[PDB]
């Protein structure tokens, strides 16, 4: 009946229209070391974040899952400020990034000590049931991530710890797949360790344009997310045109109750400001929190997708997921 948001427990029935995957803040591991030229401008960042939140509210969004990994600048206290200000529900995560772009040296060390998996489990349990540092904010989801073409042994420690923690807490698991790979593998591995498919979201599934890969992942009974609308050119990404074509094939096949949509936006980048070169920038020009509503949804409607299906995805699915 309840889910933990950054402002405390909230009835699942009150979540309403939800974006399953967006980042208010995000930094690549190592951004901390660039503190002198890349310092965190709090007031400006909160402005940007609050504005992003208001744009979502304007399209009827009431809830956001922000699955920023512990090692990528996750900041629950900041999230709580964004939420207090806007009345938005924000659910945060506990978890580490994938080994390739995460910060593995620390838990790799604890693996040599032979305590890693249990320490990770302990960390999950603590942040889900007690609180994150001294914020007294609890995570509402566990965040897992795998590398391209592989779930590494480092990554598997997290997967195994997450299944254990989900068995103990009933927590929702949300994943990152890298460049359209390992969806089926992720679902299978989690299920083999007793994870509950109705509590799992395989993320970045839109990274793969082959509907059979999707059906293979969907066969496990898990949710899948097309959560990178707007992202074009970078991190191996397909086009929105392909995202839509794939999504339409699935919806037409009756998979609406297993699909959620989002953009994976990064509203404030941690570390030093940067600008993409307009080979990529203009390809990435619709990567913002309104893109789904302004561009994608109308396109789906013009292809015969009905309001009931849209509602299933944005409202009914998150409610079922968290309950």
Residues 255 to 284: which contact Fe ion by CB under 5 A?
Answer: 264
Among 7, 16, 29, 188, contact with its own copies (rule: CB under 8 A): 29
Check residue 176 for interaction with Zn ion (CB under 5 A): yes
Is 118 within any annotated ligand binding site? Answer: no
Asked whether position 99 contacts Fe ion by CB under 5 A, the answer is no
| Nearest of 56, 15, 31, 300 to residue 172 by alpha carbon | 15
- Shortest CA distance to 232 belongs to which of 180, 185, 282, 289? 282
Ramachandran sector of residue 225 (left: φ over 0; alpha: ψ -120 to 50; beta: rest): beta
Question: Which residue of this chain has its Cβ atom nearest to Fe ion in the complex?
Answer: 264
Asked whether position 282 contacts its own copies by CB under 8 A, the answer is no
Rounded to whole angstroms, the Cα distance separating 308 from 318 reads 15
| Cβ atoms 82, 24 nearer than 8 A | yes
Residue among 126 and 310 whose Cβ is closer to its own copies? 126
CB atoms closer than 10 angstroms to residue 24: 28
Asked if 228 is part of the footprint of Zn ion (rule: CB under 5 A), the reply reads no
Query: Does 193 count as an annotated binding residue?
Result: no
Q: Which stretches does DSSP call E strand in 22-178?
A: 23-26, 63-66, 89-94, 141-145, 172-176
Of positions 49, 123, 144, 289, contacts its own copies by CB under 8 A: 123
Q: Is 263 annotated as a binding-site member?
A: no
Query: CB 142 → Zn ion: shortest distance, Å?
Result: 14
Contact footprint for its own copies (CB under 8 A): 27-37, 39, 69-71, 74, 96, 100-110, 113-115, 119, 122-123, 126-127, 130-134, 271-272, 274, 276-277
């Amino acid at each position: 009946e309840m889910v933990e948001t950054v402002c405390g427990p909230v009835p699942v029935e009150q979540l309403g229209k939800t974006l399953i995957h967006e980042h208010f803040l995000f930094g690549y591991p190592g951004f901390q070391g660039d503190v002198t030229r890349g310092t965190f401008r709090e007031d400006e960042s909160l402005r940007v974040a609050v504005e992003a939140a208001e744009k979502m509210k304007r399209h009827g969004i009431q809830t956001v899952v922000d699955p920023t990994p512990n090692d990528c600048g996750r900041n629950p206290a900041f999230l709580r400020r964004v939420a207090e200000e806007t009345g938005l529900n924000i659910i945060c995560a506990t978890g580490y990034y994938y080994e390739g772009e995460g910060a593995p040296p620390y838990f790799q060390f604890r693996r040599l000590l032979g305590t890693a998996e249990d320490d990770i489990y302990d960390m999950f349990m603590a942040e889900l049931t007690e609180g994150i540092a001294d914020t007294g904010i609890k995570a509402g989801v566990i965040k897992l991530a795998s590398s391209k073409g592989r779930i590494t042994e480092y990554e598997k420690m997290f997967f195994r710890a997450a299944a254990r923690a989900q068995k103990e807490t009933g927590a929702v698991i949300i994943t990152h797949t890298q460049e359209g790979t390992m969806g089926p593998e992720q679902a299978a591995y989690l299920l083999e360790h007793g994870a509950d498919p109705k509590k799992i979201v395989i993320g970045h599934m839109c990274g793969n344009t082959d509907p059979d890969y999707h059906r293979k992942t969907l066969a496990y009974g898990v949710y899948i997310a097309f959560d990178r609308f707007g992202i074009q050119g970078m991190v191996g990404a397909p086009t929105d045109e392909e995202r839509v074509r794939t999504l339409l094939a699935l919806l037409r096949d009756g998979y609406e109750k297993q699909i959620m949509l989002s953009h994976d936006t990064v509203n404030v980048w941690l570390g030093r400001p940067f600008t993409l070169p307009e080979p990529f920038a203009e390809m990435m020009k619709n990567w913002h929190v309104e893109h789904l509503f302004v561009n994608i949804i109308p396109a789906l409607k013009n292809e015969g997708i009905r309001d009931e299906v849209l509602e299933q995805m944005f409202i009914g699915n998150p409610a079922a997921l968290f309950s």
